[PDB]
Amino acid sequence: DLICAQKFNGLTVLPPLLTDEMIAQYTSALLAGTITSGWTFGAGAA
Amino acid sequence: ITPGTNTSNQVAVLYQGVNCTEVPNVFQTR
Numbered sequence: 812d813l814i815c816a817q818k819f820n821g822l823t824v825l826p827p828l829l830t831d832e833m834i835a836q837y838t839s840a841l842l843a844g845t846i847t848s849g850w851t852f853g854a855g856a857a
Numbered sequence: 858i859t860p861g862t863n864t865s866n867q868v869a870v871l872y873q874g875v876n877c878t879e880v881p882n883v884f885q886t887r
């Protein structure tokens with residue numbers, strides 16, 4: 812494989828800190844806040 | 858992984874991209 816050829820020469824890829832589950836949780840929180848409150852959850856409390 | 862030496866002298870070791878059964882408490886992360 813090409814990935815193993817990169818790995819065998821000291822070239823590694825670090826994983827991201829935030830996984831796609833937590834990114835989707837952030838987008839779900841923003842979407843639910845926007846739907847249920849408008850701009851008020853961005854200005855202050857929902 | 859360490860806190861400051863002003864706080865403590867205790868460290869943890871992260872072996873990157875290595876399975877925990879292939880190393881020369883133990884936790885396994887991605």
Ligand SMILES: *[C@@H]1O[C@H](CO)[C@@H](O)[C@H](O)[C@H]1NC(C)=O
Pocket residue numbers: 876877878885
């Ligand atoms: C590590 O080794 C175990 C047992 O040999 C295996 O089941 C697993 O797929 C390996 N990889 C990871 C990332 O745990």
